[PDB]
PDB file of C-alpha atoms and ligand atoms in Angstrom:
ATOM      1  CA  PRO A  21      29.356 -58.696-166.199  1.00  0.00           C
ATOM      2  CA  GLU A  22      30.457 -62.121-167.518  1.00  0.00           C
ATOM      3  CA  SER A  23      31.242 -65.073-165.217  1.00  0.00           C
ATOM      4  CA  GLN A  24      34.525 -66.922-165.450  1.00  0.00           C
ATOM      5  CA  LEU A  25      33.184 -70.070-163.772  1.00  0.00           C
ATOM      6  CA  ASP A  26      32.081 -73.239-165.560  1.00  0.00           C
ATOM      7  CA  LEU A  27      28.278 -73.175-165.863  1.00  0.00           C
ATOM      8  CA  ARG A  28      27.982 -76.146-163.585  1.00  0.00           C
ATOM      9  CA  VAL A  29      29.943 -74.357-160.895  1.00  0.00           C
ATOM     10  CA  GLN A  30      27.772 -71.284-161.483  1.00  0.00           C
ATOM     11  CA  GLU A  31      24.577 -73.173-160.718  1.00  0.00           C
ATOM     12  CA  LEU A  32      26.153 -74.709-157.616  1.00  0.00           C
ATOM     13  CA  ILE A  33      27.022 -71.246-156.282  1.00  0.00           C
ATOM     14  CA  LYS A  34      23.512 -69.858-157.036  1.00  0.00           C
ATOM     15  CA  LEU A  35      22.183 -72.636-154.788  1.00  0.00           C
ATOM     16  CA  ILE A  36      24.226 -72.372-151.590  1.00  0.00           C
ATOM     17  CA  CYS A  37      24.630 -68.538-151.772  1.00  0.00           C
ATOM     18  CA  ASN A  38      22.918 -65.112-152.132  1.00  0.00           C
ATOM     19  CA  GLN A  49      29.411 -52.834-159.866  1.00  0.00           C
ATOM     20  CA  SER A  50      32.685 -54.744-159.573  1.00  0.00           C
ATOM     21  CA  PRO A  51      34.391 -56.089-162.618  1.00  0.00           C
ATOM     22  CA  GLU A  52      33.879 -59.465-160.971  1.00  0.00           C
ATOM     23  CA  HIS A  53      30.601 -61.313-161.425  1.00  0.00           C
ATOM     24  CA  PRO A  54      28.830 -61.541-158.011  1.00  0.00           C
ATOM     25  CA  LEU A  55      28.979 -65.338-158.483  1.00  0.00           C
ATOM     26  CA  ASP A  56      32.731 -65.181-158.957  1.00  0.00           C
ATOM     27  CA  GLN A  57      32.864 -63.074-155.796  1.00  0.00           C
ATOM     28  CA  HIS A  58      31.094 -65.724-153.727  1.00  0.00           C
ATOM     29  CA  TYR A  59      33.159 -68.526-155.234  1.00  0.00           C
ATOM     30  CA  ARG A  60      36.370 -66.659-154.598  1.00  0.00           C
ATOM     31  CA  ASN A  61      35.440 -65.983-150.971  1.00  0.00           C
ATOM     32  CA  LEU A  62      35.074 -69.690-150.206  1.00  0.00           C
ATOM     33  CA  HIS A  63      38.843 -70.224-150.646  1.00  0.00           C
ATOM     34  CA  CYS A  64      37.842 -73.594-151.967  1.00  0.00           C
ATOM     35  CA  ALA A  65      38.400 -75.223-155.327  1.00  0.00           C
ATOM     36  CA  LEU A  66      35.279 -76.807-156.818  1.00  0.00           C
ATOM     37  CA  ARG A  67      35.990 -78.563-160.106  1.00  0.00           C
ATOM     38  CA  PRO A  68      33.260 -80.470-161.966  1.00  0.00           C
ATOM     39  CA  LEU A  69      33.902 -84.082-163.037  1.00  0.00           C
ATOM     40  CA  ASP A  70      32.811 -85.813-166.244  1.00  0.00           C
ATOM     41  CA  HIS A  71      29.775 -88.109-165.924  1.00  0.00           C
ATOM     42  CA  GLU A  72      31.659 -90.911-167.758  1.00  0.00           C
ATOM     43  CA  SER A  73      34.818 -90.752-165.709  1.00  0.00           C
ATOM     44  CA  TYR A  74      35.525 -93.688-163.446  1.00  0.00           C
ATOM     45  CA  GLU A  75      35.264 -91.505-160.376  1.00  0.00           C
ATOM     46  CA  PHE A  76      31.769 -90.477-161.333  1.00  0.00           C
ATOM     47  CA  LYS A  77      30.806 -94.096-161.790  1.00  0.00           C
ATOM     48  CA  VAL A  78      32.217 -95.297-158.481  1.00  0.00           C
ATOM     49  CA  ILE A  79      30.752 -92.456-156.399  1.00  0.00           C
ATOM     50  CA  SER A  80      27.462 -92.794-158.227  1.00  0.00           C
ATOM     51  CA  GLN A  81      27.522 -96.433-157.137  1.00  0.00           C
ATOM     52  CA  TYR A  82      28.498 -95.538-153.598  1.00  0.00           C
ATOM     53  CA  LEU A  83      25.477 -93.262-153.363  1.00  0.00           C
ATOM     54  CA  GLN A  84      23.003 -95.840-154.652  1.00  0.00           C
ATOM     55  CA  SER A  85      24.269 -99.068-153.062  1.00  0.00           C
ATOM     56  CA  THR A  86      24.496 -97.553-149.622  1.00  0.00           C
ATOM     57  CA  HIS A  87      21.070 -96.009-149.795  1.00  0.00           C
ATOM     58  CA  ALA A  88      19.528 -97.773-146.834  1.00  0.00           C
ATOM     59  CA  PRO A  89      16.614-100.309-147.322  1.00  0.00           C
ATOM     60  CA  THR A  90      14.698 -98.814-144.404  1.00  0.00           C
ATOM     61  CA  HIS A  91      15.036 -95.373-146.012  1.00  0.00           C
ATOM     62  CA  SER A  92      12.587 -96.254-148.797  1.00  0.00           C
ATOM     63  CA  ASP A  93      10.603 -93.075-148.401  1.00  0.00           C
ATOM     64  CA  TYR A  94      12.753 -91.515-151.194  1.00  0.00           C
ATOM     65  CA  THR A  95      15.403 -92.150-153.912  1.00  0.00           C
ATOM     66  CA  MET A  96      18.348 -90.032-155.007  1.00  0.00           C
ATOM     67  CA  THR A  97      19.699 -88.945-158.386  1.00  0.00           C
ATOM     68  CA  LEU A  98      23.227 -87.611-158.882  1.00  0.00           C
ATOM     69  CA  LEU A  99      22.887 -84.370-160.826  1.00  0.00           C
ATOM     70  CA  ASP A 100      26.450 -83.094-160.667  1.00  0.00           C
ATOM     71  CA  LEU A 101      29.710 -84.202-159.159  1.00  0.00           C
ATOM     72  CA  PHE A 102      32.477 -81.929-157.901  1.00  0.00           C
ATOM     73  CA  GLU A 103      36.038 -82.341-156.715  1.00  0.00           C
ATOM     74  CA  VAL A 104      36.735 -80.378-153.570  1.00  0.00           C
ATOM     75  CA  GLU A 105      40.204 -79.083-152.691  1.00  0.00           C
ATOM     76  CA  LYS A 106      40.409 -76.908-149.604  1.00  0.00           C
ATOM     77  CA  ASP A 107      43.796 -75.186-149.369  1.00  0.00           C
ATOM     78  CA  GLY A 108      45.778 -76.263-146.338  1.00  0.00           C
ATOM     79  CA  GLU A 109      43.721 -79.420-145.691  1.00  0.00           C
ATOM     80  CA  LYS A 110      46.099 -81.791-147.486  1.00  0.00           C
ATOM     81  CA  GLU A 111      49.047 -80.560-145.405  1.00  0.00           C
ATOM     82  CA  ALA A 112      47.187 -80.712-142.121  1.00  0.00           C
ATOM     83  CA  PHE A 113      45.757 -84.164-142.802  1.00  0.00           C
ATOM     84  CA  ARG A 114      46.809 -87.094-140.610  1.00  0.00           C
ATOM     85  CA  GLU A 115      48.139 -89.150-143.503  1.00  0.00           C
ATOM     86  CA  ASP A 116      49.965 -91.323-140.968  1.00  0.00           C
ATOM     87  CA  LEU A 117      46.795 -92.966-139.579  1.00  0.00           C
ATOM     88  CA  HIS A 118      45.355 -96.216-140.967  1.00  0.00           C
ATOM     89  CA  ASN A 119      41.678 -97.046-141.737  1.00  0.00           C
ATOM     90  CA  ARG A 120      41.286 -94.076-144.006  1.00  0.00           C
ATOM     91  CA  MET A 121      37.757 -94.106-145.383  1.00  0.00           C
ATOM     92  CA  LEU A 122      35.723 -92.100-147.839  1.00  0.00           C
ATOM     93  CA  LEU A 123      32.586 -91.272-145.791  1.00  0.00           C
ATOM     94  CA  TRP A 124      29.309 -89.295-146.145  1.00  0.00           C
ATOM     95  CA  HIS A 125      28.409 -85.965-144.548  1.00  0.00           C
ATOM     96  CA  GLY A 126      25.007 -84.313-144.941  1.00  0.00           C
ATOM     97  CA  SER A 127      23.870 -80.914-143.711  1.00  0.00           C
ATOM     98  CA  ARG A 128      21.324 -78.102-144.101  1.00  0.00           C
ATOM     99  CA  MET A 129      21.653 -75.942-147.218  1.00  0.00           C
ATOM    100  CA  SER A 130      22.452 -72.861-145.142  1.00  0.00           C
ATOM    101  CA  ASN A 131      25.628 -74.506-143.841  1.00  0.00           C
ATOM    102  CA  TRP A 132      27.501 -75.202-147.078  1.00  0.00           C
ATOM    103  CA  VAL A 133      29.066 -71.738-147.394  1.00  0.00           C
ATOM    104  CA  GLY A 134      30.450 -72.189-143.887  1.00  0.00           C
ATOM    105  CA  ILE A 135      31.603 -75.700-144.550  1.00  0.00           C
ATOM    106  CA  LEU A 136      33.305 -74.892-147.860  1.00  0.00           C
ATOM    107  CA  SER A 137      34.791 -71.700-146.320  1.00  0.00           C
ATOM    108  CA  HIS A 138      36.350 -73.107-143.139  1.00  0.00           C
ATOM    109  CA  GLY A 139      36.189 -76.863-143.504  1.00  0.00           C
ATOM    110  CA  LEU A 140      34.204 -79.116-141.186  1.00  0.00           C
ATOM    111  CA  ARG A 141      34.333 -78.108-137.526  1.00  0.00           C
ATOM    112  CA  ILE A 142      33.790 -80.171-134.431  1.00  0.00           C
ATOM    113  CA  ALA A 143      30.375 -79.633-132.829  1.00  0.00           C
ATOM    114  CA  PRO A 144      30.141 -76.215-131.088  1.00  0.00           C
ATOM    115  CA  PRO A 145      31.511 -76.136-127.459  1.00  0.00           C
ATOM    116  CA  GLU A 146      28.348 -74.556-126.000  1.00  0.00           C
ATOM    117  CA  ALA A 147      26.546 -77.868-126.270  1.00  0.00           C
ATOM    118  CA  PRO A 148      22.862 -78.529-125.739  1.00  0.00           C
ATOM    119  CA  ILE A 149      22.321 -79.411-122.084  1.00  0.00           C
ATOM    120  CA  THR A 150      22.021 -83.190-122.742  1.00  0.00           C
ATOM    121  CA  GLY A 151      25.225 -83.172-124.803  1.00  0.00           C
ATOM    122  CA  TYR A 152      25.948 -84.551-128.255  1.00  0.00           C
ATOM    123  CA  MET A 153      25.178 -88.165-129.058  1.00  0.00           C
ATOM    124  CA  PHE A 154      28.853 -89.109-129.325  1.00  0.00           C
ATOM    125  CA  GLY A 155      30.577 -86.030-128.027  1.00  0.00           C
ATOM    126  CA  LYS A 156      31.985 -82.899-129.639  1.00  0.00           C
ATOM    127  CA  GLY A 157      33.379 -84.231-132.892  1.00  0.00           C
ATOM    128  CA  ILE A 158      32.759 -84.375-136.632  1.00  0.00           C
ATOM    129  CA  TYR A 159      30.163 -86.985-137.671  1.00  0.00           C
ATOM    130  CA  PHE A 160      30.088 -89.190-140.834  1.00  0.00           C
ATOM    131  CA  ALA A 161      28.036 -92.100-142.200  1.00  0.00           C
ATOM    132  CA  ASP A 162      28.750 -95.005-144.553  1.00  0.00           C
ATOM    133  CA  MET A 163      25.133 -95.112-145.608  1.00  0.00           C
ATOM    134  CA  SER A 164      24.445 -92.279-148.053  1.00  0.00           C
ATOM    135  CA  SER A 165      20.837 -92.024-146.968  1.00  0.00           C
ATOM    136  CA  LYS A 166      21.755 -91.792-143.309  1.00  0.00           C
ATOM    137  CA  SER A 167      23.712 -88.588-144.068  1.00  0.00           C
ATOM    138  CA  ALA A 168      21.162 -87.319-146.606  1.00  0.00           C
ATOM    139  CA  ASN A 169      18.456 -87.326-143.912  1.00  0.00           C
ATOM    140  CA  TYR A 170      20.611 -84.578-142.358  1.00  0.00           C
ATOM    141  CA  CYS A 171      20.039 -82.382-145.450  1.00  0.00           C
ATOM    142  CA  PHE A 172      16.460 -81.626-144.451  1.00  0.00           C
ATOM    143  CA  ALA A 173      15.336 -81.684-148.040  1.00  0.00           C
ATOM    144  CA  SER A 174      11.639 -81.462-148.939  1.00  0.00           C
ATOM    145  CA  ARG A 175       9.406 -82.012-151.983  1.00  0.00           C
ATOM    146  CA  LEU A 176       9.768 -78.327-152.807  1.00  0.00           C
ATOM    147  CA  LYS A 177      13.399 -77.990-151.841  1.00  0.00           C
ATOM    148  CA  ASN A 178      14.436 -81.309-153.413  1.00  0.00           C
ATOM    149  CA  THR A 179      18.045 -80.429-154.307  1.00  0.00           C
ATOM    150  CA  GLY A 180      20.688 -80.933-151.618  1.00  0.00           C
ATOM    151  CA  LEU A 181      24.379 -81.679-151.239  1.00  0.00           C
ATOM    152  CA  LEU A 182      26.365 -84.592-149.895  1.00  0.00           C
ATOM    153  CA  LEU A 183      29.965 -84.242-148.923  1.00  0.00           C
ATOM    154  CA  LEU A 184      32.476 -87.075-149.415  1.00  0.00           C
ATOM    155  CA  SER A 185      35.627 -86.911-147.282  1.00  0.00           C
ATOM    156  CA  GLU A 186      38.743 -88.899-146.606  1.00  0.00           C
ATOM    157  CA  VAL A 187      38.514 -89.641-142.872  1.00  0.00           C
ATOM    158  CA  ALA A 188      41.516 -90.903-140.919  1.00  0.00           C
ATOM    159  CA  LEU A 189      39.759 -93.155-138.443  1.00  0.00           C
ATOM    160  CA  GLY A 190      42.828 -94.896-137.095  1.00  0.00           C
ATOM    161  CA  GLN A 191      41.783 -97.157-134.203  1.00  0.00           C
ATOM    162  CA  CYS A 192      38.061 -97.114-133.557  1.00  0.00           C
ATOM    163  CA  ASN A 193      36.496 -97.256-130.207  1.00  0.00           C
ATOM    164  CA  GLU A 194      33.404 -99.280-131.077  1.00  0.00           C
ATOM    165  CA  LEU A 195      30.240 -98.404-129.134  1.00  0.00           C
ATOM    166  CA  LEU A 196      26.752 -99.961-129.043  1.00  0.00           C
ATOM    167  CA  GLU A 197      24.745 -97.001-127.721  1.00  0.00           C
ATOM    168  CA  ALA A 198      24.871 -93.187-127.548  1.00  0.00           C
ATOM    169  CA  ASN A 199      27.345 -91.668-125.135  1.00  0.00           C
ATOM    170  CA  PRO A 200      28.147 -87.941-124.741  1.00  0.00           C
ATOM    171  CA  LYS A 201      31.391 -88.951-123.031  1.00  0.00           C
ATOM    172  CA  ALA A 202      32.635 -90.805-126.098  1.00  0.00           C
ATOM    173  CA  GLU A 203      35.750 -88.641-126.615  1.00  0.00           C
ATOM    174  CA  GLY A 204      36.821 -89.520-123.123  1.00  0.00           C
ATOM    175  CA  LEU A 205      36.314 -93.219-123.767  1.00  0.00           C
ATOM    176  CA  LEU A 206      38.948 -93.161-126.528  1.00  0.00           C
ATOM    177  CA  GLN A 207      41.944 -93.843-124.278  1.00  0.00           C
ATOM    178  CA  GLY A 208      44.465 -93.239-127.018  1.00  0.00           C
ATOM    179  CA  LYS A 209      42.414 -94.462-129.963  1.00  0.00           C
ATOM    180  CA  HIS A 210      41.708 -91.990-132.732  1.00  0.00           C
ATOM    181  CA  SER A 211      37.930 -92.127-133.230  1.00  0.00           C
ATOM    182  CA  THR A 212      34.530 -93.447-132.140  1.00  0.00           C
ATOM    183  CA  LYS A 213      32.509 -95.861-134.232  1.00  0.00           C
ATOM    184  CA  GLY A 214      28.858 -96.277-133.201  1.00  0.00           C
ATOM    185  CA  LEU A 215      27.813 -99.760-134.310  1.00  0.00           C
ATOM    186  CA  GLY A 216      24.694-100.328-136.426  1.00  0.00           C
ATOM    187  CA  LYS A 217      22.497-103.355-137.144  1.00  0.00           C
ATOM    188  CA  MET A 218      23.548-102.941-140.767  1.00  0.00           C
ATOM    189  CA  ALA A 219      26.559-101.829-142.764  1.00  0.00           C
ATOM    190  CA  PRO A 220      28.595-102.355-145.896  1.00  0.00           C
ATOM    191  CA  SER A 221      30.858-105.366-145.564  1.00  0.00           C
ATOM    192  CA  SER A 222      34.508-105.479-146.668  1.00  0.00           C
ATOM    193  CA  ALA A 223      33.851-108.006-149.413  1.00  0.00           C
ATOM    194  CA  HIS A 224      32.484-105.309-151.760  1.00  0.00           C
ATOM    195  CA  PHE A 225      34.950-102.615-150.639  1.00  0.00           C
ATOM    196  CA  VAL A 226      37.034-100.758-153.154  1.00  0.00           C
ATOM    197  CA  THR A 227      39.921 -98.309-153.240  1.00  0.00           C
ATOM    198  CA  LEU A 228      39.819 -94.765-154.601  1.00  0.00           C
ATOM    199  CA  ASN A 229      43.008 -92.675-154.399  1.00  0.00           C
ATOM    200  CA  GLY A 230      44.201 -94.234-151.152  1.00  0.00           C
ATOM    201  CA  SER A 231      40.943 -94.366-149.244  1.00  0.00           C
ATOM    202  CA  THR A 232      38.703 -97.357-148.747  1.00  0.00           C
ATOM    203  CA  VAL A 233      35.202 -96.814-150.224  1.00  0.00           C
ATOM    204  CA  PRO A 234      32.705 -99.029-148.397  1.00  0.00           C
ATOM    205  CA  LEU A 235      30.441 -99.915-151.299  1.00  0.00           C
ATOM    206  CA  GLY A 236      27.093-101.576-150.665  1.00  0.00           C
ATOM    207  CA  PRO A 237      24.955-103.548-150.435  1.00  0.00           C
ATOM    208  CA  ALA A 238      24.549-103.372-146.663  1.00  0.00           C
ATOM    209  CA  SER A 239      24.080-106.556-144.678  1.00  0.00           C
ATOM    210  CA  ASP A 240      23.129-107.533-141.158  1.00  0.00           C
ATOM    211  CA  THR A 241      26.050-107.122-138.730  1.00  0.00           C
ATOM    212  CA  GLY A 242      24.438-109.260-136.024  1.00  0.00           C
ATOM    213  CA  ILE A 243      24.898-106.437-133.593  1.00  0.00           C
ATOM    214  CA  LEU A 244      22.405-106.024-130.789  1.00  0.00           C
ATOM    215  CA  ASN A 245      22.503-103.723-127.767  1.00  0.00           C
ATOM    216  CA  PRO A 246      21.777-105.791-124.615  1.00  0.00           C
ATOM    217  CA  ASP A 247      20.557-102.624-122.875  1.00  0.00           C
ATOM    218  CA  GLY A 248      18.406-100.452-125.089  1.00  0.00           C
ATOM    219  CA  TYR A 249      18.050 -99.254-128.662  1.00  0.00           C
ATOM    220  CA  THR A 250      20.693-100.206-131.193  1.00  0.00           C
ATOM    221  CA  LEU A 251      21.601 -97.885-134.099  1.00  0.00           C
ATOM    222  CA  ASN A 252      20.316 -98.814-137.543  1.00  0.00           C
ATOM    223  CA  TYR A 253      23.559 -97.861-139.291  1.00  0.00           C
ATOM    224  CA  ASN A 254      27.158 -97.042-138.221  1.00  0.00           C
ATOM    225  CA  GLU A 255      28.360 -93.541-137.406  1.00  0.00           C
ATOM    226  CA  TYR A 256      32.002 -92.499-137.329  1.00  0.00           C
ATOM    227  CA  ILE A 257      33.216 -89.597-135.193  1.00  0.00           C
ATOM    228  CA  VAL A 258      36.604 -87.890-135.202  1.00  0.00           C
ATOM    229  CA  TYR A 259      37.545 -85.196-132.702  1.00  0.00           C
ATOM    230  CA  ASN A 260      40.189 -83.201-134.616  1.00  0.00           C
ATOM    231  CA  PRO A 261      39.541 -81.566-137.988  1.00  0.00           C
ATOM    232  CA  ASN A 262      42.946 -82.802-139.207  1.00  0.00           C
ATOM    233  CA  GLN A 263      41.435 -86.296-139.495  1.00  0.00           C
ATOM    234  CA  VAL A 264      39.225 -84.932-142.310  1.00  0.00           C
ATOM    235  CA  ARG A 265      39.970 -84.021-145.892  1.00  0.00           C
ATOM    236  CA  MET A 266      37.074 -82.981-148.126  1.00  0.00           C
ATOM    237  CA  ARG A 267      37.245 -84.480-151.643  1.00  0.00           C
ATOM    238  CA  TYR A 268      33.827 -84.575-153.348  1.00  0.00           C
ATOM    239  CA  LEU A 269      30.638 -82.575-153.364  1.00  0.00           C
ATOM    240  CA  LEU A 270      27.554 -84.211-154.800  1.00  0.00           C
ATOM    241  CA  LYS A 271      24.633 -82.151-156.027  1.00  0.00           C
ATOM    242  CA  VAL A 272      21.793 -84.623-155.479  1.00  0.00           C
ATOM    243  CA  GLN A 273      18.101 -84.741-156.308  1.00  0.00           C
ATOM    244  CA  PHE A 274      15.621 -86.181-153.828  1.00  0.00           C
ATOM    245  CA  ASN A 275      12.679 -88.054-155.369  1.00  0.00           C
ATOM    246  CA  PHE A 276       9.982 -88.527-152.755  1.00  0.00           C
ATOM    247  CA  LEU A 277       7.456 -91.342-153.236  1.00  0.00           C
ATOM    248  CA  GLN A 278       3.678 -90.888-153.791  1.00  0.00           C
TER     249      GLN A 278
HETATM  250  N1  UHB B 301      32.312 -74.837-140.899  1.00  0.00           N
HETATM  251  C1  UHB B 301      31.014 -75.083-140.691  1.00  0.00           C
HETATM  252  N2  UHB B 301      30.112 -74.142-141.044  1.00  0.00           N
HETATM  253  C2  UHB B 301      28.809 -74.423-140.924  1.00  0.00           C
HETATM  254  N3  UHB B 301      28.230 -75.540-140.475  1.00  0.00           N
HETATM  255  C3  UHB B 301      29.147 -76.441-140.111  1.00  0.00           C
HETATM  256  C4  UHB B 301      30.525 -76.301-140.181  1.00  0.00           C
HETATM  257  N4  UHB B 301      31.157 -77.451-139.739  1.00  0.00           N
HETATM  258  C5  UHB B 301      30.166 -78.250-139.424  1.00  0.00           C
HETATM  259  N5  UHB B 301      28.926 -77.703-139.619  1.00  0.00           N
HETATM  260  C6  UHB B 301      27.638 -78.308-139.312  1.00  0.00           C
HETATM  261  O1  UHB B 301      27.448 -78.220-137.918  1.00  0.00           O
HETATM  262  C7  UHB B 301      26.527 -79.238-137.519  1.00  0.00           C
HETATM  263  C8  UHB B 301      26.954 -79.819-136.170  1.00  0.00           C
HETATM  264  O2  UHB B 301      28.069 -79.551-135.763  1.00  0.00           O
HETATM  265  N6  UHB B 301      26.112 -80.590-135.455  1.00  0.00           N
HETATM  266  C9  UHB B 301      24.734 -80.965-135.778  1.00  0.00           C
HETATM  267  C10 UHB B 301      24.650 -82.466-135.933  1.00  0.00           C
HETATM  268  N7  UHB B 301      25.079 -83.144-134.701  1.00  0.00           N
HETATM  269  C11 UHB B 301      24.976 -84.598-134.831  1.00  0.00           C
HETATM  270  C12 UHB B 301      25.519 -85.161-136.132  1.00  0.00           C
HETATM  271  O3  UHB B 301      26.492 -84.665-136.690  1.00  0.00           O
HETATM  272  N8  UHB B 301      24.874 -86.253-136.583  1.00  0.00           N
HETATM  273  C13 UHB B 301      25.273 -87.108-137.637  1.00  0.00           C
HETATM  274  C14 UHB B 301      25.361 -88.482-137.421  1.00  0.00           C
HETATM  275  C15 UHB B 301      25.718 -89.311-138.472  1.00  0.00           C
HETATM  276  C16 UHB B 301      25.998 -88.782-139.720  1.00  0.00           C
HETATM  277  C17 UHB B 301      25.889 -87.408-139.931  1.00  0.00           C
HETATM  278  C18 UHB B 301      25.534 -86.551-138.905  1.00  0.00           C
HETATM  279  C19 UHB B 301      25.487 -85.147-139.440  1.00  0.00           C
HETATM  280  N9  UHB B 301      25.813 -85.329-140.840  1.00  0.00           N
HETATM  281  C20 UHB B 301      26.030 -86.615-141.181  1.00  0.00           C
HETATM  282  O4  UHB B 301      26.249 -87.023-142.318  1.00  0.00           O
HETATM  283  C21 UHB B 301      26.451 -82.743-134.367  1.00  0.00           C
HETATM  284  C22 UHB B 301      26.552 -81.244-134.221  1.00  0.00           C
HETATM  285  C23 UHB B 301      26.456 -80.255-138.676  1.00  0.00           C
HETATM  286  O5  UHB B 301      25.175 -80.252-139.306  1.00  0.00           O
HETATM  287  C24 UHB B 301      27.553 -79.789-139.642  1.00  0.00           C
HETATM  288  O6  UHB B 301      27.169 -79.958-141.005  1.00  0.00           O
END
């Protein structure tokens, strides 16, 4: 009958999901094995992440804006222990996805791309993909004017040593040669000057600027992507409930 979850967590669950004594909402929430605790809109963490979202909304993604409706702290049991805390270049990075995938993601954590690949391969191999531009990830939410509420995931990502690459390459994991991740280089990115620290992870705050990068061969990426090939380089921390405002 009556739910034991904060109302904000209730509405989150209604969104990504769907007589016991347990409310069916509380059932779904319990079966995620994932803490989701709402944060106060005046707290520092809300302010910083709110800024992260807005300042790293890409200039060439002007076909919409985003509003932060609700902010959540994510704590997946076991992830802190498994995490590669040893590695340097630990960044708080964006991950966007279809609505149908959030139960899976909150239930098992982020997985590397499925082993039965498409026949071309993945753009940068079988890993877990992140962005430092909020709107680059949000375009992976496949939101619409009707379905204009989506989620963005913020995660601590142990990048360690990056293998920097100018173009797409399915064999990227192989090209690592001992380094701990791939970084696909974009024409534009946040620069270290405006960077900030939140609980031991660098947060690459905007604005983005030209990186002077050009691919001498073909097409060069608009914005960076970061790829790690072991889930223990990932630790979920925040879940943003975000509103997409499409123009005209
Ligand atoms: N446990 C899980 N349950 C359900 N879905 C899960 C899951 N773990 C990952 N996923 C989802 O699988 C999907 C996946 O592997 N894919 C599809 C996407 N593809 C390329 C890719 O990741 N591009 C890409 C590039 C840059 C940034 C971002 C992405 C995706 N999200 C971003 O913010 C790589 C293979 C992905 O959309 C992820 O959200």
